[PDB]
């Protein structure tokens, strides 16, 4: 049985490899396990940080934004997340044409 932390380690390495597809899959699995109440050294915000950017890297801005908003519900002061929100929004606005 792969734990939330196991999923996270796998996703983190995928991330560095820039394998965003597998980052999203592993990070998603981590999150679900967390959402279901798994007792883990890893936290939701950290999963969300990777997950949101991985989804972005694959071109789903809409979903990247939602995950970002989700992270910020949890950690409103999150620096990267706050930046990401404005960035994603900027690109989306410039996208609409």
């Amino acid at each position: 049985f792969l734990t939330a932390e196991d999923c996270f380690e796998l996703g983190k390495v995928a991330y560095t490899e820039a394998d965003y597809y597998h980052t999203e899959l592993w990070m998603e699995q981590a999150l679900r396990q967390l959402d279901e109440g798994e007792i883990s050294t890893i936290d939701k915000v950290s999963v969300l940080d990777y997950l949101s950017y991985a989804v972005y890297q694959q071109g789903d801005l809409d979903k990247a934004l939602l995950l970002t908003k989700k992270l910020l519900e949890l950690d409103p002061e999150h620096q990267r997340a706050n930046g990401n929100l404005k960035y994603f929004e900027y690109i989306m606005a410039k996208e609409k044409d």
Partner: peptide, 6 residues
């Protein structure tokens, strides 16, 4: 963060 825009 690794491949971040910043």
């Amino acid at each position: 963060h690794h491949h971040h825009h910043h």
